[PDB]
Design a binder for this molecule. Structure first.
Ligand SMILES: CCCCCCCCCCCCCCCCCC(=O)OC[C@H](COP(=O)([O-])OCC(O)COP(=O)([O-])OC[C@@H](COC(=O)CCCCCCCCCCCCCCCCC)OC(=O)CCCCCCCCCCCCCCCCC)OC(=O)CCCCCCCCCCCCCCCCC
Ligand SMILES: CCCCCCCCCCCCCCCCCC(=O)OC[C@H](COP(=O)([O-])OCC(O)COP(=O)([O-])OC[C@@H](COC(=O)CCCCCCCCCCCCCCCCC)OC(=O)CCCCCCCCCCCCCCCCC)OC(=O)CCCCCCCCCCCCCCCCC
Ligand SMILES: CCCCCCCCCCCCCCCCCC(=O)OC[C@H](COP(=O)(O)OCCN)OC(=O)CCCCCCCCCCCCCCCCC
Ligand SMILES: CCCCCCCCCCCCCCCCCC(=O)OC[C@H](COP(=O)(O)OCCN)OC(=O)CCCCCCCCCCCCCCCCC
Ligand SMILES: CCCCCCCCCCCCCCCCCC(=O)OC[C@H](COP(=O)(O)OCCN)OC(=O)CCCCCCCCCCCCCCCCC
Ligand SMILES: CCCCCCCCCCCCCCCCCC(=O)OC[C@H](COP(=O)(O)OCCN)OC(=O)CCCCCCCCCCCCCCCCC
Ligand SMILES: CCCCCCCCCCCCO[C@@H]1O[C@H](CO)[C@@H](O[C@H]2O[C@H](CO)[C@@H](O)[C@H](O)[C@H]2O)[C@H](O)[C@H]1O
Ligand SMILES: CCCCCCCCCCCCO[C@@H]1O[C@H](CO)[C@@H](O[C@H]2O[C@H](CO)[C@@H](O)[C@H](O)[C@H]2O)[C@H](O)[C@H]1O
Ligand SMILES: CCCCCCCCCCCCO[C@@H]1O[C@H](CO)[C@@H](O[C@H]2O[C@H](CO)[C@@H](O)[C@H](O)[C@H]2O)[C@H](O)[C@H]1O
Ligand SMILES: CCCCCCCCCCCCO[C@@H]1O[C@H](CO)[C@@H](O[C@H]2O[C@H](CO)[C@@H](O)[C@H](O)[C@H]2O)[C@H](O)[C@H]1O
Ligand SMILES: CCCCCCCCCCCCO[C@@H]1O[C@H](CO)[C@@H](O[C@H]2O[C@H](CO)[C@@H](O)[C@H](O)[C@H]2O)[C@H](O)[C@H]1O
Ligand SMILES: Nc1nc2c(ncn2[C@H]2C[C@H](O)[C@@H](COP(=O)(O)OP(=O)(O)OP(=O)(O)O)O2)c(=O)[nH]1
Ligand SMILES: [Mg+2]
Lengths: 320, 51, 105, 55, 345, 172, 142, 98, 120
C-alpha cells in the first residue's frame, strides 16, 4: 500500500520512528573546505545516511538506471564552461545555478522522505538553504543579470518555505587565500580559473546572510580547518546538542503526514521550479525542446513508466 | 485585453500566497502604578500587554 | 421530494408535520383543521393542475378561515356604520354591549 | 474591398464589439461592497417588474 | 486536517444535499443548504493565506444572505397557507424571491460576481466541489417547484448568465476563472429549460459535471493555474493533449461531441414552446465560449509554447496520476453522442 | 392595551432600523439586545412563553460574545453612534418619518388590509381552547424528543459538526 | 399597474399617427434604460465623488432618452411620409437614427455606424415580431 | 396579527437592506444577519401561536440552532480577516479582483 | 412529466411491468458501442500512465469492456421501458379523448388546387 492517509491511519506514523539521531545535518563551507570528508565521517559515526552534494546529474543518477545522462537531458549546463567563461552570452551561468537549485531541492525532498519514513538521520553537503551563496557571488561578479536574481528568489520563495530546515548546520571556515591554495593543489584545470573575488563573495554571503539566518532556527556549529580535520571532535559536539529551537519542535503526526505527502511526490516537489517566467537564459524554444524530449523517451528504460520497459527486462506487462 | 482601468493589475502569485506589508504590532501600553495596590505606591511599572 | 427515499423505505422523517391538519401534541387541533382536511382530501389523487380549479371552493374557505380577510372587513363595516349612527344620534348600544350585561351562567 | 472594408465591417467589427463588451463587464474591483450594492439593484428591479405586471 | 475532522466535515458536505433532495418539508430543505455552507467553509480556507481567507469570507456572506431570503420565502408561505411546501396558491412574489435567492446561491448572473473570485482563491480540488457537488441542492429545490416559477425571470437570468459567462471567460488568463465563467454559462442553459422540461435541466447538469470533473483533474495533474502553465503540457504530460482538446470542444458544444447534446435538446424544447427569440440569442452567444476554449486549445495541443530548462528534471520523475476515473469521464464526456436517445428519455 | 402589540412591533421595527444603519458594533450589539427583548414581549403577547424567553436568552449570550469580539477586532479610535454622523442621523429620522407615512397611507387606501388602525386589538388572539390544560409552547418544542426526532437529529449534528468546523477555521 | 398601460398605448393606434404620444413613450423607455444602466455603472464602477456619480447618471439617462426620442420620432415620421403603417423598414430607419444619435453623443463614427446597423436590425425585428405574433417570454405549453 | 406581521416583514427588509449596503466593519454586517434571523424567528413563532400549530414549534428553535452555527462560523472567519489585516474592514478583502 | 403517473414506484430502476418487454440483444449495436468505449477507456488510461497502450493490463482492459457492456445492458432495459411507457400513455390518452384527435379525411390531388409558381 503506497503511503497515504490510509497507511497513516493504520499505524504508519513518523513520531514512532524518531529517535536521538533522526536529524537533518548539513555541512557548509567555501570551495575545497573539506565538507565531503567531514560529512562522510559524521554520517558514518552517527549511523546516518550520507548524501553526497547534489550535482548536475543528481536527478539522472536517482532515476532510470542511475547512470549519468547526456547533458542536454540534464540541464544543458556545465560547471567547466562556467569557469572558462562565466559571462558567456548563452546563459550558462544562471542556467547552471537554476538547475543546481532544483537538483538540491530534489535531494532535500529525497533526504526528508528517507528520514520521515525510516527515522534514520541524514547528512547533506550544502542545501537549498545555502545554495544562494553561489547565486550572490555570480551576481556580485556580474556573471548573471539582476532579472536572473529575481527569478531565483521567486522560485526559492515558492519552494523552500514548504520544508523543515536542518536540525544542525555545520560550517567549516577556511579563509579565501587558503581556499585558493587548495584549489591549485586540487589540480582541476577549469576550477583553477576561479577568481579570489568570487570566492570572497561566497564567504561574504555565508557569513553575513546564511549563518545569522540559520542561527535563528537551527543549531549552528562553526569550525576552523584544524578543528574539522578531526571529525570525531565534530561528532562529539553533535552528540550533546540540545535542539531547543526551530520548527521541528511543533511537528506532530499529522503535520508530518502532509509533509511526507509532499516529499514522496517528486513532480509536486519540482512544480514551482518550472513556472512559465520567460527568462532567456532558461527558456527553450519548442523545436529544441521537443527534439530533446523526443530523444529522452527513446533512451533505454525511459519510453514507458518503470516496470513497463520490455527492452530492459520488465516482465508480466500484460498483467500490470 | 488591456484597459485603462486594469492597467495596474498584476498577475496573482504563482502559489496563491501574497507578500503583504508587515502588519502593525499593537500592544497595549499600561501604567501599572505608582498609585496601584500592587505597586507599593511608588512603582511605575510600564507594561506592554497583549490581552 | 426530489428523491423519494422516505417513501421508498416507508419511513417518515418530515412527512407527518407538513400542514395544519397533521397530528398535534395531546390532540390539540390547530386552527382551521377541518377546512384544511377538506381541502387536502378534495385535492387528493387528481393532481395540482385540476385541484386548482376543482377544489377552488375548499381552498377559498380554508384561506378565509386562516387569514380571515372577509371576517375582518365585515366587522370593520359594522363597526364603521355604528360609529356613523352614534355620532348622528340615531343608535344607542344596548346595555349588554356597554358593559352592564347579566352574566351567564 | 477585400483587404480593408470587407475586413473592417464584418470580422473586425465583430471582434471589436465583443472585446469592448468583455472589458466593460470584467473590469470588476473585487469589492464585496460594490457587488452587494448591485445585488440590491437586481432585487429592486425584480420587485418592480412584478408590481407593474400585477393584474 | 486529522482523519476525524476530514470524516466529519466531508460527511456533512455530502449530507446537506442529500437532506435537501430527500426532504418534504421546506425547512429541512433549508437545513440541508445550511449544512452545505457551514461544512464547505473550512475546506475553502484550509490552506490559510490572504486569498483563501478572502474567498471563504466572500463565499460566506453571499451564501448566508441568500439563505436568509430563502428562509423568508418559506416563512411567508407558512404564514399564507399553513404548510411547509410551496403550492399552486403560493403568492407569486414569494416564489420570485425564492428564484432570486437560489440563483444567487448558484452564481447565476447578475448574482454571479462572487463566483469567479471565490473559485480563483481556493485549491483546484475545492473549485471542483464548488462548481459540481454544490450545485445539486439549490437546483433540486428549483426542480420541485418548476410549474410555479416565472418564465420571464428565468429567461432573463438565463440569457444574462450566458451573455456574462461568455464575455467573462473571454478576458481570462486564469484557469480557475475560466471554469467559473464556464459554470455560469452552463447554469444559464440549465435554468432556461427548467420551467419547460426539468429533465433536460438534469441532462445538462450531468453532462456539465462529467465534463468539468475531468477538466479539473487535468488541471490538478500539474497544478496548472494559468494559460501559460497549461501551455507546458506538451513537455510535462503530452498524453493528456488529446483528451483536454476534446473536453474543451465538448464544453463548447461542438458536434459531434457529447456536449453538443444539451444545447441541441434545450433549443429543441425551447422552440416547441415558441421560445424562439431567446433560443436564438442563447445559441448565438454560446459561440463566444467556443472562441476562448479554442484559444486555450491553441496554447496546449495545436502549438507548442516555449518551455524551460528545469522541466527536464520533471521528465526524469514518474507520476502516479491521473486515476482511472479521469479516463472514464473523459471518454463518456466526449464520445457518447451516438447514445443520445438513451440520455434524454 | 389595544395598541400594545402594535407598539411593540413598532419598537421592533425601529430597532432593526438602528441596526441597519450599522454604527459601531458596540451599539449594534445593544440594538439587537433591545430588539430581542421587544421580540420576546411580542411572542409572549401572542400567548407564547417558552419561545419568547429562549430567544432573549440565546441573544443575551450571543451578543456577549460579539461584545468580546468587537473590543478585539472591530474597534476604532472613535466608535460611531447613531448621532455621530449627520448622514446616519438624518436617515434614522427620515426612516422613522417614512414609517409613520407608510402606516398612515396604507391605512387610508385599504383600512383593513395590511394596516387596520381601527381594529387594533380585535385580531390578536383568534381562537383559544378555554378549558384546556396541555397547551403551552414548551410542549410543542418538546415534540423534538418524541414525534419530531428528525428535527433534533439535524440540530444536534449541526452543533456537533460546528465544533469541528470552528476549530479548523481558527487554527493557523 | 397604470405604468404598464402607459406603454401599451404605443400600439393602441397604427404607426405613423399620434407621433407625439409615441415619441413620449419611447423617450420614457429610453430614459428608464439609462437609469438602470447608470445604477449598475455607479454601483460597480464608483465615481471619484458624488457630484461625478450624479453627473454620470444624468449623462447616461439623457443620452439614452435622446436615443429613444429619435427612434420613436423617426419611425413615426417615416411611416407617415411613406404611408406604410406595417412596414418593418420604418423601424429600421428609426433604429438607425437612434444608432446615429448614440454615435453623435459619444463622438464616434464607428459607434454611429455600428450603432445604426445593430439598432436598426433589432428594431426591424421587433416590428416583425409584433406583426407575426412572436413571444419574448412564452409560458410553458408542452 | 395583520399589522404585526407587516411590521415584522418590514423589520426583515431593513435588516436585509443593512446586509446589502456595506459600510466598513464586517462585524456590523454580521449583526445585520442576526437581525434577519431574529425577525424570522418571531414571524415563525407568532404564526405557530396564531394558528395553534403546536407541531411546528420545533421549527423556530431549529432556526436559532443553525443561526448560531452560521454566526459562529462568521465570527471564526472574522478572526482570520483580522489576523491578516489588523482590522475587519471589507475594503481590504479585494485581492481576488486579479 | 411522467413521474407523477399512476402506479409509479419511487426509485425503482426496473419496474416489474418492464418484464413484458423483449430484452435487448447482447450484440445490440448500442451495447457493442458501449463495449468499444470501455475498450477506448482502457487504452486512454494506459496512455495517460505512460504504459504500452495495447499490451499493458489486459485484465484491466477486460474489466473496462465488461463493465461498460454490463451497465449498458441494464440501462438500455430501463430506457426501453421508459419509451414503452411513454407510448402506452400517449395512445391511451388518445383513446380517452377522441374529440381532441379526430380522424381527418384527406382529399386527393384531383380536388386540391395547389398554386403553380412558374420558374423563369
Ligand atoms: C440616560 C439619559 C442620557 C444621559 C446621557 C448624559 O449623561 O448626557 C450626555 C449628553 C450631554 O451632552 P454631552 O455630555 O456633551 O455628550 C457627550 C456624550 O459622550 C455623547 O453621548 P454618547 O457618546 O453616549 O452617544 C450618544 C448615542 C449613544 O446613546 C445610545 O444610543 C444608547 C442608548 C440607546 C437606547 O446616542 C445616539 O446616538 C442617539 C440615540 C438615538 C436612539 C437610538 C435609536 C436607534 C437604535 C434603536 C435600538 C434602541 C437601542 O446628553
Ligand atoms: C427613506 C430611507 C429611510 C431610512 C432607511 C435606511 C435603510 C438602512 C440604511 C442602510 C444604508 C447603509 O448602510 O449604506 C451605507 C452606505 C455606505 O456608507 P459608508 O461606507 O460609511 O460611507 C459612504 C457614505 O456616503 C458616508 O460617507 P460620506 O459622508 O462621504 O457620503 C457623502 C454623501 C453620500 O450621499 C448620500 O447621501 C447617499 C444617500 C442618497 C439619498 C438617498 C435617499 C433615499 C432613497 O453625502 C452627501 O453629501 C449627500 C447628502 C444629501 C443626500 C440627500 O452609505 C450610503 O451610501 C448611504 C446610506 C444611507 C442610504 C439609505 C437609503 C437606502 C435606500 C436604498 C438606496 C439604494 C437604491 C439603489 C437602487 C435604486
Ligand atoms: C480509510 C482511507 C481513507 C483515505 C482514502 O482512501 O481516501 C482518499 C482520501 C485521501 O487520499 P490520500 O491522502 O492522497 O491517500 C489515500 C490513501 N488511501 O481520503 C480523504 O482525503 C478523506 C476522505 C474523507 C471521506 C470519507 C469519510 C468516511 C466517513 C465514514
Ligand atoms: C435521475 O436523476 O435522472 C435525471 C435525468 C432524467 O430526468 P428525469 O426523468 O426527470 O428524472 C426522474 C427519473 N430519472 O437523467 C439524465 O439526465 C441522464 C444523464 C445522462 C448523462 C450522460 C453522460 C454520458 C454517459 C453515457 C453512458 C450512459 C449509458 C448510455 C446508454 C447505454 C445503453 C447502451
Ligand atoms: C435594462 C438596461 C440594462 C443595462 C445593463 C447594465 C449596463 C450598465 C453598464 O454600463 O455597465 C456597468 C458596469 C460598468 O460600466 P462602466 O464602467 O461604468 O461604463 C464604462 C466606463 N468606460 O458593467 C458591469 O460590470 C456589468 C453590469 C452588471 C450586470 C447588469 C445586469 C443586467 C440586468 C439583468 C437582470 C436580470 C433579471 C433576472
Ligand atoms: C453576430 C453577428 C456578427 C456578423 C454581422 C456583421 C454585420 C455588421 C455590419 C455593420 C458593421 C459596421 C461597423 C463599421 C466599423 C465600425 C467600427 O469598427 O468601430 C466600432 C466602434 C468601436 O468602438 P470605439 O470606437 O473603440 O469607442 C469605444 C466604444 N466603447 O463601436 C463599437 O464597437 C461599440 C458600438 C456599440 C453600439 C452598437 C450596438 C450594440 C448594442 C446592440 C443592440 C442590439 C439590440
Ligand atoms: C471528429 C474527429 C475527431 C478528431 C479527434 C481529435 C484527435 C485529437 C486532436 C488533438 C491532438 C492532441 O495533440 C497532440 O498530442 C500529441 C500527443 O498525443 C502530440 O504528439 C507529439 O508531441 C508529443 C510531445 O508534445 C510527443 O511526445 C509525441 O510523441 C509527438 O507525436 C502532438 O504534438 C499534439 O498536437
Ligand atoms: C444519512 C443520515 C440519516 C440517517 C440518520 C437518521 C436516522 C433516522 C433517525 C430519526 C428517525 C425518525 O423516525 C421517524 O420517527 C417518526 C416520529 O418522529 C415516526 O413517525 C410516526 O409517528 C408519528 C407521530 O406523530 C406519526 O405522526 C407518523 O405518521 C408515524 O410515521 C416515523 O415513522 C419514523 O420513521
Ligand atoms: C433604438 C433602437 C432600439 C432597438 C431595440 C428594439 C426597439 C423596439 C422597442 C421599442 C418599441 C416601442 O416600445 C415598445 O412598445 C410598447 C411601449 O409602449 C410596449 O409594447 C408592449 O408592451 C407589453 C410588453 O411589456 C406587451 O405585452 C404589449 O402587448 C406591447 O404593447 C413595450 O414595452 C415596448 O418595448
Ligand atoms: C442622415 C445622415 C446624418 C448624419 C448625421 C448623423 C451622424 C452622426 C455622426 C456623429 C459622428 C461623431 O461625431 C464626431 O465625433 C468626432 C470624433 O472624432 C468629434 O470630432 C472632434 O473632436 C475630436 C476629439 O473629440 C477631434 O479628434 C476631431 O478632430 C474633432 O472634429 C466630434 O464629436 C464629431 O465631429
Ligand atoms: C440570424 C438571426 C436569426 C436566426 C433565424 C432563426 C431561424 C429563422 C426564424 C424563422 C422565424 C419563425 O417564424 C415564426 O415561426 C413560428 C413558429 O413556427 C410561427 O409563429 C407562431 O407560432 C405559433 C403557431 O404555430 C403561435 O402560437 C405563435 O404565437 C406564433 O409565433 C410562425 O411560423 C412565425 O411567426
Ligand atoms: N557555480 C556553482 N558551482 C558550484 C555550486 N556547488 C558546487 N559548485 C562547484 C564549486 C566547486 O568548483 C565544485 C566542487 O564542489 P566543492 O565546493 O564542494 O569543492 P570540493 O568538493 O572539492 O571540496 P569539499 O571537500 O567538498 O568541501 O562544485 C553551485 O551551487 N554553483
Ligand atoms: Mg565537494
Amino acid at each position: 500500500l503506497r503511503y497515504g492517509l490510509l497507511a497513516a491511519i493504520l499505524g504508519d506514523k513518523t513520531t514512532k520512528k524518531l529517535h536521538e539521531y533522526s536529524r537533518v545535518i548539513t555541512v557548509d563551507g567555501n570551495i575545497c573546505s573539506g565538507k565531503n570528508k567531514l560529512a562522510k565521517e559524521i554520517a558514518q559515526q552517527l549511523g546516518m545516511k550520507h548524501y553526497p552534494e547534489a550535482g548536475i546529474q543528481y536527478s539522472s543518477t536517482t532515476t532510470g538506471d542511475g547512470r549519468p545522462l547526456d547533458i542536454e537531458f540534464s540541464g544543458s549546463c556545465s560547471l567547466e564552461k562556467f569557469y572558462d567563461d562565466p559571462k558567456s552570452n548563452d546563459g550558462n551561468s544562471y542556467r547552471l545555478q537554476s538547475w543546481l537549485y532544483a537538483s538540491r531541492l530534489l535531494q532535500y525532498a529525497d533526504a526528508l522522505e528517507h528520514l520521515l519514513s525510516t527515522g534514520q538521520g541524514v547528512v547533506l553537503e550544502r542545501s537549498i538553504y545555502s545554495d544562494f551563496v553561489f547565486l550572490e557571488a555570480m551576481y556580485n561578479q556580474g556573471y548573471i543579470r539582476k532579472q536572473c536574481v529575481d527569478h531565483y528568489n521567486e522560485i526559492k520563495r515558492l519552494t523552500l518555505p514548504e520544508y523543515l530546515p536542518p536540525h544542525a548546520v555545520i560550517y567549516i571556515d577556511v579563509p579565501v587565500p587558503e581556499v585558493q591554495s587548495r584549489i591549485q593543489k586540487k589540480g582541476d584545470p577549469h576550477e583553477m580559473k576561479v577568481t579570489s573575488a568570487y570566492l570572497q563573495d561566497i564567504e561574504n554571503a555565508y557569513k553575513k546572510t546564511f549563518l545569522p539566518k540559520m542561527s535563528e532556527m537551527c543549531e549552528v556549529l562553526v569550525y576552523d580547518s584544524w578543528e574539522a580535520e578531526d571529525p570525531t571532535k565534530v561528532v562529539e559536539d553533535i552528540e550533546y546538542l540540545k535542539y531547543n529551537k526551530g520548527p521541528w519542535l511543533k511537528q506532530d503526526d499529522w503535520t508530518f503526514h502532509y509533509l511526507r505527502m509532499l516529499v514522496q511526490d517528486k513532480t509536486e516537489v519540482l512544480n514551482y521550479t518550472t513556472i512559465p517566467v520567460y527568462l532567456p537564459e532558461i527558456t527553450i524554444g519548442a523545436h529544441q525542446g521537443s527534439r530533446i524530449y523526443n530523444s529522452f523517451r527513446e533512451l533505454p528504460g525511459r519510453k514507458y513508466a518503470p516496470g513497463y520497459n520490455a527492452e530492459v527486462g520488465d516482465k508480466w506487462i500484460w498483467l500490470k | 485585453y488591456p484597459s485603462k482601468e486594469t492597467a495596474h493589475w498584476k498577475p496573482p502569485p504563482w502559489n496563491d500566497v501574497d507578500i503583504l506589508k508587515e502588519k502593525a504590532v499593537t500592544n497595549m501600553t499600561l501604567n501599572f502604578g505608582p498609585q496601584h495596590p500592587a505597586a507599593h505606591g511608588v512603582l511605575r511599572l510600564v507594561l506592554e500587554l497583549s490581552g | 421530494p426530489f428523491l423519494d427515499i422516505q417513501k421508498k423505505l416507508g419511513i417518515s422523517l418530515d412527512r407527518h408535520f407538513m400542514f395544519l391538519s397533521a397530528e398535534q401534541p395531546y390532540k390539540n387541533a390547530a386552527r382551521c383543521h377541518a377546512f384544511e382536511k377538506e381541502w387536502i382530501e378534495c385535492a387528493h389523487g387528481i393532481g395540482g393542475t385540476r385541484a386548482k380549479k376543482e377544489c377552488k371552493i375548499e381552498f377559498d374557505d380554508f384561506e378565509e378561515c386562516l387569514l380571515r380577510y372577509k371576517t375582518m372587513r365585515r366587522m370593520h363595516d359594522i363597526k364603521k356604520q355604528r360609529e356613523k349612527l352614534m355620532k348622528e344620534g340615531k343608535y344607542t348600544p344596548p346595555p349588554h354591549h356597554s358593559g352592564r350585561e347579566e352574566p351567564r351562567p | 474591398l477585400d483587404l480593408i472594408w470587407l475586413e473592417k465591417t464584418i470580422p473586425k467589427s465583430t471582434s471589436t464589439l465583443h472585446t469592448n463588451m468583455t472589458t466593460l463587464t470584467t473590469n470588476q474591483k473585487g469589492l464585496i461592497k460594490l457587488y452587494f450594492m448591485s445585488f440590491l439593484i437586481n432585487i429592486i428591479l425584480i420587485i418592480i417588474l412584478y408590481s407593474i405586471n400585477l393584474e | 486536517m486529522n482523519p476525524i475532522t476530514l470524516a466529519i466535515i466531508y460527511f456533512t458536505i455530502f449530507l446537506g444535499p442529500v437532506i435537501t433532495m430527500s426532504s418534504t418539508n421546506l425547512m429541512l430543505m433549508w437545513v440541508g443548504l445550511e449544512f452545505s455552507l457551514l461544512a464547505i467553509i473550512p475546506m475553502l480556507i484550509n490552506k490559510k493565506n490572504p486569498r483563501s481567507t478572502e474567498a471563504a469570507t466572500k463565499y460566506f456572506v453571499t451564501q448566508a444572505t441568500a439563505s436568509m431570503i430563502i428562509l423568508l420565502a418559506i416563512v411567508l408561505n407558512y404564514k399564507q397557507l399553513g404548510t411547509w411546501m410551496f403550492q399552486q396558491q403560493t403568492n407569486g412574489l414569494i416564489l420570485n424571491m425564492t428564484l432570486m435567492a437560489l440563483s444567487m446561491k448558484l452564481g447565476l448572473a447578475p448574482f454571479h460576481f462572487w463566483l469567479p473570485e471565490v473559485t480563483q482563491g481556493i485549491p483546484l480540488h475545492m473549485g471542483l466541489i464548488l462548481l459540481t457537488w454544490q450545485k445539486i441542492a439549490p437546483l433540486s429545490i428549483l426542480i420541485q417547484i418548476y410549474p410555479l416559477l416565472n418564465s420571464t425571470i428565468i429567461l432573463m437570468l438565463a440569457i444574462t448568465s450566458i451573455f456574462m459567462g461568455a464575455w467573462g471567460g473571454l478576458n481570462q488568463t486564469q484557469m480557475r476563472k475560466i471554469m467559473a465563467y464556464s459554470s455560469i454559462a452552463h447554469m444559464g442553459w440549465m435554468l432556461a429549460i427548467l420551467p419547460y422540461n426539468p429533465s433536460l435541466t438534469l441532462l445538462n447538469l450531468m453532462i456539465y459535471i462529467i465534463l468539468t470533473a475531468p477538466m479539473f483533474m487535468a488541471l490538478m495533474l500539474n497544478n496548472s493555474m494559468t494559460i501559460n502553465s497549461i501551455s507546458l503540457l506538451w513537455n510535462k504530460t503530452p498524453a493528456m493533449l488529446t483528451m483536454i482538446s476534446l473536453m474543451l470542444l465538448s464544453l463548447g458544444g461542438l458536434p459531434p461531441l457529447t456536449g453538443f447534446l444539451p444545447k441541441w435538446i434545450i433549443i429543441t424544447e425551447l422552440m416547441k414552446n415558441n421560445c424562439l427569440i431567446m433560443a436564438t440569442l442563447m445559441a448565438m452567444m454560446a459561440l463566444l465560449n467556443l472562441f476562448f476554449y479554442t484559444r486555450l486549445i491553441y496554447s496546449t495541443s495545436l502549438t507548442m509554447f516555449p518551455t524551460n530548462n528545469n522541466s527536464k528534471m520533471m521528465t526524469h520523475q514518474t507520476k502516479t496520476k491521473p486515476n482511472l476515473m479521469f479516463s472514464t469521464l473523459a471518454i463518456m464526456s466526449t464520445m457518447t453522442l451516438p447514445l443520445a436517445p438513451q440520455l434524454i428519455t | 392595551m389595544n395598541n400594545y402589540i402594535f407598539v411593540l412591533s413598532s419598537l421592533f421595527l425601529v430597532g432593526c432600523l438602528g441596526l441597519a444603519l450599522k454604527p459601531s458594533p458596540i451599539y449594534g450589539g445593544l440594538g439587537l439586545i433591545v430588539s430581542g427583548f421587544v421580540g420576546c414581549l411580542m411572542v409572549l403577547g401572542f400567548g407564547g412563553s417558552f419561545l419568547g424567553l429562549m430567544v432573549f436568552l440565546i441573544y443575551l449570550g450571543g451578543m456577549l460574545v460579539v461584545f468580546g469580539y468587537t473590543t478585539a477586532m472591530a474597534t476604532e479610535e472613535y466608535p460611531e453612534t447613531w448621532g455621530s454622523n449627520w448622514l446616519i442621523l438624518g436617515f434614522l429620522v427620515l426612516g422613522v418619518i417614512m414609517e409613520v407615512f407608510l402606516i398612515c397611507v396604507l391605512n387610508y387606501y385599504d383600512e383593513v388590509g395590511v394596516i387596520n388602525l381601527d381594529g387594533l386589538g380585535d385580531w390578536l388572539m383568534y381562537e383559544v381552547d378555554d378549558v384546556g390544560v396541555m397547551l403551552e409552547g414548551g410542549i410543542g418544542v418538546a415534540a423534538m424528543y418524541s414525534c419530531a426526532t428528525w428535527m433534533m437529529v439535524v440540530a444536534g449534528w449541526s452543533l456537533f459538526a460546528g465544533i469541528f468546523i470552528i476549530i479548523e477555521i481558527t487554527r493557523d | 399597474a397604470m405604468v404598464k398601460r402607459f406603454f401599451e398605448s404605443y400600439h393602441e393606434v397604427p404607426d405613423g399617427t399620434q407621433c407625439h404620444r409615441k415619441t413620449y413613450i419611447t423617450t420614457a423607455l429610453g430614459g428608464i434604460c439609462g437609469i438602470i444602466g447608470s445604477a449598475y455603472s455607479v454601483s460597480l464602477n464608483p465615481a471619484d465623488s458624488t457630484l461625478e456619480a450624479v453627473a454620470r447618471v444624468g449623462r447616461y439617462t439623457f443620452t439614452a432618452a435622446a436615443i429613444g426620442a429619435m427612434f420613436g420620432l423617426t419611425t413615426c415620421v417615416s411611416a407617415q411620409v411613406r404611408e406604410k403603417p406595417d412596414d418593418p423598414l420604418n423601424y429600421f430607419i428609426g433604429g438607425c437614427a437612434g444608432g446615429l444619435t448614440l454615435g453623435a453623443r459619444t463622438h464616434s463614427y464607428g459607434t454611429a455606424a455600428m450603432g445604426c446597423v445593430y439598432m436598426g436590425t433589432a428594431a426591424a425585428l421587433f416590428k416583425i415580431g409584433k406583426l407575426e405574433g412572436w413571444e419574448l417570454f412564452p409560458t410553458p405549453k408542452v | 396579527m395583520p399589522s404585526t406581521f407587516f411590521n415584522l416583514t418590514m423589520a426583515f427588509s431593513l435588516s436585509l437592506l443593512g446586509t446589502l449596503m456595506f459600510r466598513s466593519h464586517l462585524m456590523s454586517t454580521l449583526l445585520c444577519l442576526e437581525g434577519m434571523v431574529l425577525s424570522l424567528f418571531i414571524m415563525t413563532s407568532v404564526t405557530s401561536l396564531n394558528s395553534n400549530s403546536m407541531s411546528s414549534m420545533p421549527i423556530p428553535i431549529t432556526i436559532l440552532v443553525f443561526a448560531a452555527c452560521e454566526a459562529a462560523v462568521g465570527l471564526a472567519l472574522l478572526v482570520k480577516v483580522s489576523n491578516t489585516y489588523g482590522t475587519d474592514y471589507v475594503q481590504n478583502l479585494n485581492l481576488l479582483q486579479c | 412529466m411522467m413521474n407523477g403517473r399512476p402506479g409509479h414506484e419511487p426509485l425503482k430502476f426496473l419496474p416489474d411491468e418492464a418484464r413484458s418487454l423483449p430484452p435487448p440483444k447482447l450484440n445490440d449495436p448500442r451495447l457493442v458501442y458501449m463495449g468499444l468505449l470501455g475498450y477506448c477507456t482502457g487504452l486512454m488510461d494506459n496512455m495517460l500512465r505512460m504504459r504500452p497502450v495495447m499490451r499493458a493490463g489486459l485484465h484491466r482492459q477486460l474489466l473496462f469492456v465488461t463493465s461498460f457492456v454490463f451497465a449498458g445492458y441494464f440501462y438500455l432495459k430501463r430506457q426501453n421501458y421508459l419509451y414503452a411507457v411513454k407510448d402506452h400513455d400517449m395512445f391511451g390518452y388518445i383513446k380517452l379523448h377522441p374529440e381532441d384527435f379526430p380522424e381527418k379525411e384527406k382529399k386527393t390531388y384531383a380536388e386540391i388546387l395547389e398554386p403553380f409558381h412558374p420558374v423563369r
